[PDB]
Ligand binder design. Structure first.
Ligand SMILES: [Ca+2]
Length: 474
């Protein structure tokens, strides 16, 4: 009667792995450990041990070590084959000032803590706060940003961490639009150090901003040729052999030419539907990826609870509120103020008028059916929020501290969304966008100027809205 068990594991340099039989009895007529590959490391005494410690050495490169345990009872032979790979430590570095990249990164961290329990994480987020308990649960050390970008504090901490290791891999996670502001200050002083490798870069769209920039860039003559030409410009800048850096797209969409890089697109299909971006689609190739929305649902219940706790979203309360009335649910997107020099009771009153129109059956912009009212005012809306809320007794408030990206990622979008237009709509599925309202600004003074604005043009191309869905409110 024969049993063979096999397994494999990565062991970080200087850490310990206990070699042991897999699912075997605790005693044997005879037994032995053998090493079958890798630099000899097995102690003589351990050959007759049942379990013993493998302490990963510090090496010039990764190396696998194979061990076989053979154990014999009177009716059964047990074999365990364990292959251990000694690997460099990995430092994960997270830098973001916006919401969506930080939220995506947080999900990744929750996953990676379980899959890679030895990895240290350095985190600089502006809009996501991790308290001490959660930071320790996730092996996070937090560092401030300098304004919106990488701080000297973080640069120094990374330098010190690297100096402390025999070898090191660094993974970067940051936002696409400002990757050039965030990563070179870390890469440059490390560049000359052969023991430090940038093993991966994950870039995440912040929101509509990357799409406005692509829209404004798509008709640039010779744009891919210029992009190609600036690879060396980026490279020499990182290498410290030139003080000159690429400007524009060349410092954003060339990273995959130099490092293993993923670009997570909020709307990757923009690269398909906009014909003048087919050349960028081709240039990015497999490095362009679709940002996922369902990873939260694939987390465990406790992992989900941790996420929700960190972002401060009482999901169950909102689900209860959605279910209070059996009517489908409508979220009105509120704003603070706009142009006109107006009083605050006007900006609130105008928003009240929009909502009134939405729920008025005789209005041409009627939502279409009876909905329960919900309100998401601007995080700094203040008494405007209070005035608007007080005008609709049954309307349920959704705390402004709770970003719209959180709703989408936790599958908590309502049945329909409408109100004052902003970048949040870029994030919502088309069948859930009822209408968006533009107000007077420095650049928008009537409906026609709203429709021609870059943001709307991209949303029209992506089919998020149709022109009829775009309204103007002086
Ligand atoms: Ca309801």
């Amino acid at each position: 009667k024969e049993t063979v068990s096999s397994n494999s594991a990565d062991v970080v340099e200087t850490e310990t792995y206990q070699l042991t039989p897999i699912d075997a009895p605790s005693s044997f007529l005879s037994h032995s450990w053998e090493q079958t590959c890798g630099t000899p490391i097995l102690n003589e005494s351990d050959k007759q041990a049942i379990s013993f410690d493998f302490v990963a050495p510090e090496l010039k490169q990764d190396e696998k070590y194979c061990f076989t345990f053979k154990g014999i009872t009177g009716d059964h032979r047990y074999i365990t084959n364990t292959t251990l790979t000694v690997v460099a430590p990995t430092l994960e570095v997270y830098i973001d000032h916006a919401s969506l990249p930080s939220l995506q990164q947080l999900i990744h961290i929750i996953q990676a803590k379980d899959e890679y329990p030895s990895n240290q994480r350095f985190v600089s987020w502006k809009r996501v706060t991790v308290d001490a308990d959660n930071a320790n649960k996730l092996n996070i050390h937090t560092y401030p940003l300098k304004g919106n970008n990488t701080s000297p504090e973080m640069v120094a901490a990374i330098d010190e961490y690297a100096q402390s290791k025999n070898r090191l891999n660094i993974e970067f996670y940051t936002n696409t639009a400002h990757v050039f502001n965030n990563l070179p200050p870390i890469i440059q002083p490390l560049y000359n150090n052969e023991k430090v490798k940038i093993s991966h870069i994950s870039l995440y769209d912040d929101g509509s901003s990357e799409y406005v920039s692509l829209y404004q860039w798509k008709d640039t003559p010779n744009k891919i040729e210029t992009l190609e030409g600036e690879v060396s410009l980026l490279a020499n800048y990182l290498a410290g052999t030139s003080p000159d850096a690429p400007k524009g797209m060349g410092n954003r969409y060339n990273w995959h030419k130099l490092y293993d890089t993923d670009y997570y697109f909020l709307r990757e299909d923009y690269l398909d539907v906009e014909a003048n971006l087919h050349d960028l689609r081709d240039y990015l190739g497999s490095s362009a990826k679709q940002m996922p929305w369902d990873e939260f649902a694939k987390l465990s219940d406790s992992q989900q609870t941790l996420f929700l706790d960190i972002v401060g979203f009482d999901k169950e309360q909102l689900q209860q509120q959605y279910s209070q009335s059996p009517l489908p649910n409508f979220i009105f997107t509120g704003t603070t103020t706009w142009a006109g020099g107006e009083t605050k009771e006007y900006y609130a009153q105008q928003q009240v008028n929009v909502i009134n129109n939405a729920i008025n059956e005789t209005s041409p912009y009627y939502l279409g059916k009876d909905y329960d009212l919900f309100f998401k005012g601007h995080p700094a809306g203040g008494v405007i929020n209070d005035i608007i809320l007080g005008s609709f007794p049954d309307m349920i408030n959704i705390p402004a501290k709770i970003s719209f990206e959180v709703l989408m990622m936790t599958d908590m979008l309502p049945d329909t969304v409408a109100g004052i237009a902003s970048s949040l709509y870029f994030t919502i599925p088309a069948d859930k966008v009822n209408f968006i309202v533009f107000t007077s600004s420095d650049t928008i003074t009537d409906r026609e100027e709203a429709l021609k604005s870059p943001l709307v043009q991209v949303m029209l191309t992506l089919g998020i809205v149709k022109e009829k869905d775009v309204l103007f409110w002086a």
